[PDB]
Design a protein around this motif. Structure first.
Motif, short mmCIF file in Angstrom:
data_model
loop_
_atom_site.label_atom_id
_atom_site.label_comp_id
_atom_site.label_asym_id
_atom_site.label_seq_id
_atom_site.Cartn_x
_atom_site.Cartn_y
_atom_site.Cartn_z
N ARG A 31 0.82 -1.21 0.00
CA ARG A 31 0.00 0.00 0.00
C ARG A 31 0.85 1.27 0.00
O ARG A 31 0.51 2.25 -0.67
CB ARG A 31 -0.99 -0.03 1.16
N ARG A 87 0.73 4.03 -2.98
CA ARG A 87 0.53 5.45 -2.71
C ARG A 87 1.63 6.29 -3.35
O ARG A 87 1.37 7.37 -3.89
CB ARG A 87 0.46 5.70 -1.20
N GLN A 128 -2.84 12.50 -2.85
CA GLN A 128 -2.84 11.26 -2.09
C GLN A 128 -2.50 11.57 -0.64
O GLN A 128 -1.68 12.45 -0.36
CB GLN A 128 -1.85 10.24 -2.67
N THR A 132 -1.60 10.02 3.34
CA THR A 132 -1.20 8.97 4.26
C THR A 132 -1.45 9.45 5.69
O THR A 132 -1.28 10.64 5.98
CB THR A 132 0.27 8.57 4.05
N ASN A 159 -7.21 3.32 5.46
CA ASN A 159 -7.46 3.54 4.04
C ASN A 159 -8.70 4.39 3.81
O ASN A 159 -8.68 5.28 2.96
CB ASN A 159 -7.59 2.20 3.32
N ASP A 160 -9.78 4.12 4.54
CA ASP A 160 -10.99 4.93 4.39
C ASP A 160 -10.76 6.37 4.81
O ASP A 160 -11.22 7.30 4.13
CB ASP A 160 -12.14 4.33 5.19
N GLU A 175 -7.90 8.03 4.76
CA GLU A 175 -7.06 8.66 3.75
C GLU A 175 -7.85 8.97 2.49
O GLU A 175 -7.70 10.04 1.90
CB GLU A 175 -5.87 7.76 3.44
N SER A 176 -8.71 8.04 2.07
CA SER A 176 -9.50 8.25 0.86
C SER A 176 -10.46 9.42 1.02
O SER A 176 -10.66 10.21 0.09
CB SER A 176 -10.27 6.98 0.50
N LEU A 213 -6.11 -1.33 9.21
CA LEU A 213 -5.59 -0.88 7.93
C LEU A 213 -6.71 -0.36 7.03
O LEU A 213 -6.54 0.65 6.34
CB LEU A 213 -4.82 -2.01 7.25
N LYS A 214 -7.85 -1.06 7.01
CA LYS A 214 -8.99 -0.58 6.24
C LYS A 214 -9.52 0.73 6.78
O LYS A 214 -9.94 1.61 6.02
CB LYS A 214 -10.09 -1.64 6.21
#
Lengths: 164, 164, 164, 164
Positions: A16, A20, B37, B39, B11-12, B14-15, B7-8
Motif C-alpha cells: 500500500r 501510494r 494522495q 497517508t 485507508n478509508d 485517507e480516501s 488498515l482498512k
C-alpha cells in the motif's frame, strides 16, 4: 502460524505504501517511468505501560495543604536569645495515572527505494531529468511514505534509464 | 485479523481526506488537473488516564478552614521578653478528578502530497501557474486536510505538467 | 465497527455544515457559483469529571462558625506584663460538588474551505468580486460554520474563476 | 517439528528480501543481469521483560512531598551557640512500569550478497559498469534490504560478467 500472519501484514503495508507513492509519481513522470519498492520494520511486541506523575510542591505558592502546625517560641533575655520553630505540614499532591497498551503491528522504521526513468523526446534521446524535478520527486515520495526522523526513515531516489 | 480492520480504517480515512481535497481543488484547477494522495499515522493504542488537581491554598485569602487553634502568649518582663505562638490549622481544599478514555483510531500525524497540472491555453502551450494561485491551492489544501502544527502535519504541493 | 460509525457521524456533521454555508451563500453569489467543503476534528473520548469548590473563609466577615472558645488573660504587674490568648474556632464552609459527563462526539476544531466564482456580465467578461463582498462572504461563512476562537477554527475563502 | 517451521519462516523471509531487491534492480540493470541471495539470522528465543523507572527527586524544586516536619532551634548565649535542625520528609515519586514481550521470529543480523552482470553493447563487448552506477546499486540494495547498523548488517555487491 502467527509469523505468517505478521509477514502478510507487513507485505500488505509495504504494497500500500508502494501504491501510494506510485499514484502521485505517475501523473508527472508517466506510467511505467517510475518503480518503487517498500520494506517495513514492524512492531509485533506486546507492551503494557503504567505512568504515574506527581506535580512538584516544593514552592509554597503552589503547595496544597490539609493540616499545618506551626509552634513558634522566642525567649529573648544577641544575648541569651532562644528561638524555636516546630513546623509540621501535611500536603495533598496532584496525581496523574496513565495506562497505555501499545498497538501490535506498528511501524518502527521505513526505508523506501524509488527509481525513475529518463526522458525520451520525440527524437528518442534519453534526456536525464533536472535537479529541481528530482527534488520534487524526493519531496513527493517523502510525503507519500510518511517520512519521519524519529522513526529513522531513509529514502533514496535515483535517476537511470530503464532497460528494454 | 484486527490489523486488517485497522488498515482498512486508515485507508478509508485517507480516501475521504483525498476526496475532500479534490472536491475544492476541482472547480478552479479543473477535473483531472489535480491529483492528491493522503497517508495517515493513526493511534490504535488503548490509553486510560485519571487526573487529580488540587487548588493551592498557601495564601491566607483563598484558604478554606474547618478548625483553627491559635494560642498566643507574651510575657514581657528587649529585656526578658517571651513570645510564644502555637498555631494549628485544618484546611479543606478544592479537588477535581478527571477520568479520560482516549478514542482508538485517532490521527497522530497527517502528511499529504498534492500535484497540479499546467495550463494549456487555446493555442495549447502548457503555461505554468502563478505564485498567488499556488498559495491559494496551498491554503485550500491546508483547510481541507485539517492542517495543524501540534500534530506535526506536513503538506507539499508542486506544479508540473501531466504526462500523456 | 465503532470507528465506521464515528466516521459516518463526522461525515454527516461536515455535510450539514457545508449545506448550511451553501444555503446562505447561494442567494447572493448564485447557484453553482459557490463551493464549500468542511472537515471536523471530533471528540470520541469518554471523559468523567467531579469538581469540588470551597468558598474561602479567611476573612472574619464571611466566616461561618459553629463553636468558638476565646480564653483571654492579662496579668499586669511595660513592666511584668503577661498577655495570653487561646482561641479555638470551628467553621462551616460552603461546598459545591459538580459531576460532569462530557458528550461523546463533540467538535474540537473546525476548518472550512470555501471557493467562489467570478462574475460574468452580459458581455461575458469574468469580472472578479470586490473587497466588501469578500468580507461579507467571510462574515456569512463564519456565522454559518459557528466560528469560534476557543476551538481554534480556521476559515479561508478565496475568489477564482471556475473551470468549464 | 518446530525447527522445520522456524527454518521455513527464515526461508520465506530471505526469499521476500531477495525478491524486493530484484524488483528494483531489474528495471535499470535488466532482467537476468542481476542475481541476489539473502541469509537471515533470526530470533526464536522467547523473552519477557518488566522495566521500572523512578524519576529522581534529589532537587528540592522537582521533589513532591506528602508530609514534612522541620524542628529548628537556636539557643544563642561565636560564644555558646547551639543550633539544632531536625528535618523529616516523606516523598511521592513518579513511577513507570513497562512490560514487554518480544516477538518470536525477529531479525537479528541480515547479510546480503548481490552480483550484477556486465554490459554487452550492440557490438557485444562486455563493458563493465561505472563507479557511480555501482554506488547507486549499493544504495538501492541497502534501501531494499532495510540496512541498519544496530543490527550489524553487511552488504557486498560485486560486478562480474555472467557465464554462458
Amino acid at each position: 502460524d502467527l509469523n505468517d500472519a505478521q509477514l502478510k501484514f507487513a507485505n500488505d503495508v509495504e504494497s500500500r505504501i508502494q501504491r501510494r507513492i506510485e499514484a502521485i509519481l505517475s501523473p508527472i513522470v508517466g506510467n511505467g517511468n517510475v518503480h518503487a519498492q517498500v520494506t517495513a520494520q514492524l512492531d509485533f511486541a506486546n507492551k503494557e505501560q503504567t505512568e504515574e506523575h506527581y506535580s512538584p510542591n516544593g514552592d509554597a505558592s503552589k503547595a496544597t495543604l490539609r493540616s499545618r502546625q506551626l509552634n513558634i517560641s522566642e525567649q529573648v533575655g544577641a544575648g541569651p536569645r532562644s528561638t524555636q520553630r516546630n513546623e509540621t505540614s501535611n500536603y495533598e499532591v496532584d496525581r496523574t495515572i496513565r495506562h497505555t497498551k501499545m498497538n501490535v503491528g506498528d511501524i518502527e522504521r521505513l526505508s523506501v527505494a524509488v527509481v525513475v526513468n529518463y526522458k525520451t523526446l520525440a527524437d528518442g534521446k534519453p534526456l536525464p531529468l533536472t535537479a529541481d524535478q528530482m527534488k520534487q520527486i524526493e519531496d513527493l515520495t517523502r510525503e507519500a511514505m510518511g517520512f519521519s526522523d524519529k522513526r529513522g526513515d531513509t529514502l533514496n531516489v535515483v535517476n537511470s534509464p530503464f532497460s528494454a
